[PDB]
């Protein structure tokens, strides 16, 4: 217990293993320690550490935060096998500055601490406004087809899709910087929506099973094709491919033959259940020498975050459609929802990533809450709403309490 | 001897250890000094710490 071995980082990156005195105060070691790292760098043939003007030498954690100069190395939470960094921190002493006349003083200070609008942000805002605009136009065009059978909806939407896509295509070839690419990506992201309803609107007669199949098909193809050719925005495109593909299969079955929705809903739940287990493997297969490691790591992380999210959307939509307050053995889907919630709650903590673990944890809470709301709006009564409210408020309160206590 | 003698006047326990080995001077990183060479041959000057 008299000494601890730790790695010390020095100038430009040399890590050196050292056996330090565990109880002397850290300020006693930084001077001779600087001499030692310099001696080794000199023999290695490298350039030694040097001061610049006014400042001091300190020993810090890898995070840069300095250790308290008067405390012992054992007094701080430093253990054998950890690492530290020796660093130069410059002098902050300078004159103070004063402006008395109030109007000038407000203008001066307020301009140094905040950011003004610029031409770069103006274009990103413009792109965002047009994307929002076209989804509103397709919405009203779709709302017309859902009550009318004329060619108008497909003819009108097709030209919009082609025009937006033509602009995005021309922008992608010319983009030079990430600022330019974000503008183009927003434009491209919006092109998928009109083409989807444009195709689904083509088959005549009343809307339903046969029309739905085309939309989810072209949606799945377009999202996948955009990803393949662009190689950016993995998350948003991947999530669409999952929900699109799974919906296409269900739509095809219902169009051909299906005894009940419960059958399809149960099938989807089962498909997602196995997919949650296979999720990391799917991501691993879907995903000068050092670069090869860095690129692959974030790629897999991207695909996995979207995958886990898309499955969440399917099960919440499916489970809320499976449970009911009046049909048959009312308790059966409720306990099934409970078991489903427990699995997601337990398995969500195994993933070593904040957004993946957080997104999975949140997915369970919304499923539970949706069932409670269903059991309050339908089968309505004063006791029922009172009971649901108590359950609905205490459930998340208890979840927080388990972590806070 | 003088270090142990001084420690007792301060009320501190003298240097003591168990096992096969020996006592010697070391640098802040634990590296022992050379046993057969002068402190003038080594890089030791007034105000250094050991």
């Amino acid at each position: 217990p008299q000494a601890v071995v730790v790695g010390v980082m020095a100038g430009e990156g040399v890590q050196i293993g050292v056996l330090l005195d565990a109880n002397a105060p850290v300020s006693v070691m930084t001077d001779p320690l600087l001499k030692v790292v310099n001696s080794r760098l000199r023999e290695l043939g490298e350039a030694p550490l040097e001061a610049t003007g006014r400042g001091r030498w300190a020993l810090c954690l890898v995070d840069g935060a300095p250790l308290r100069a008067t405390q012992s190395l054992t007094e701080q939470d430093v253990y054998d096998g950890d690492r530290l960094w020796i660093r130069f921190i410059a002098d902050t002493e300078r004159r103070s500055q004063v402006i008395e006349h109030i109007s000038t003083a407000v203008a001066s200070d307020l301009s140094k601490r905040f950011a003004r609008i610029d031409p770069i942000v103006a274009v990103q805002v413009g792109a965002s406004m047009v994307a929002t605009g076209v989804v509103l136009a397709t919405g009203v065009l779709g709302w017309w087809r859902w009550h009318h059978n004329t060619w108008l909806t497909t003819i009108y939407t097709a030209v919009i899709g082609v025009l937006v896509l033509a602009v995005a295509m021309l922008l992608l070839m010319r983009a030079k910087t990430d600022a330019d690419r974000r503008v183009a990506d927003i434009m491209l992201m919006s092109a998928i929506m009109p083409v989807t309803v444009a195709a689904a609107a083509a088959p005549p007669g009343p809307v339903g099973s046969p029309q739905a199949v085309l939309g989810f098909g072209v949606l799945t193809v377009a999202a996948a094709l955009a990803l393949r050719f662009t190689g950016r925005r993995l998350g948003i495109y991947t999530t669409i491919v999952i929900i699109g593909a799974l919906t296409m299969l269900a739509a095809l079955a219902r169009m051909v033959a299906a005894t009940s929705a419960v059958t399809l809903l149960s099938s989807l739940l089962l498909i997602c259940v196995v997919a949650y287990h296979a999720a990391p493997a799917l991501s691993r297969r879907l995903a000068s020498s050092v670069r090869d490691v860095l690129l692959q790591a974030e790629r897999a992380r991207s695909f996995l975050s979207g995958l886990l999210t898309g499955l969440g959307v399917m099960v919440v939509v499916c489970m809320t459609s499976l449970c009911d307050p009046h049909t048959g053995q009312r308790w059966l889907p409720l306990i099934l929802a409970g078991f489903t919630s427990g699995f997601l709650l337990l398995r969500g903590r195994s993933y070593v990533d904040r957004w993946q673990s957080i997104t999975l944890a949140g997915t369970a809470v919304i499923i539970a809450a949706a069932v409670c709301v269903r059991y309050a709006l339908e089968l309505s009564s004063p006791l029922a709403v009172s009971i649901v409210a108590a359950i609905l408020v205490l459930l998340p309160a208890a979840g927080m309490a388990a972590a806070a206590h | 001897k003088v270090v142990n003698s001084r420690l007792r006047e301060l009320g501190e326990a003298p240097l003591e250890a168990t096992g096969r080995g020996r006592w010697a001077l070391c640098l802040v990183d634990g590296a022992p000094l050379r046993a057969t060479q002068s402190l003038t041959e080594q890089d030791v000057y007034d105000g250094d710490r050991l």
Partner: peptide, 18 residues
């Protein structure tokens, strides 16, 4: 400055001569 800081500076200065 503390006694420790003073001795720390004093030891550093004790290393040099004309």
């Amino acid at each position: 400055v503390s006694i420790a800081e003073a001795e720390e500076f004093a030891q550093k200065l004790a290393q040099w001569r004309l």
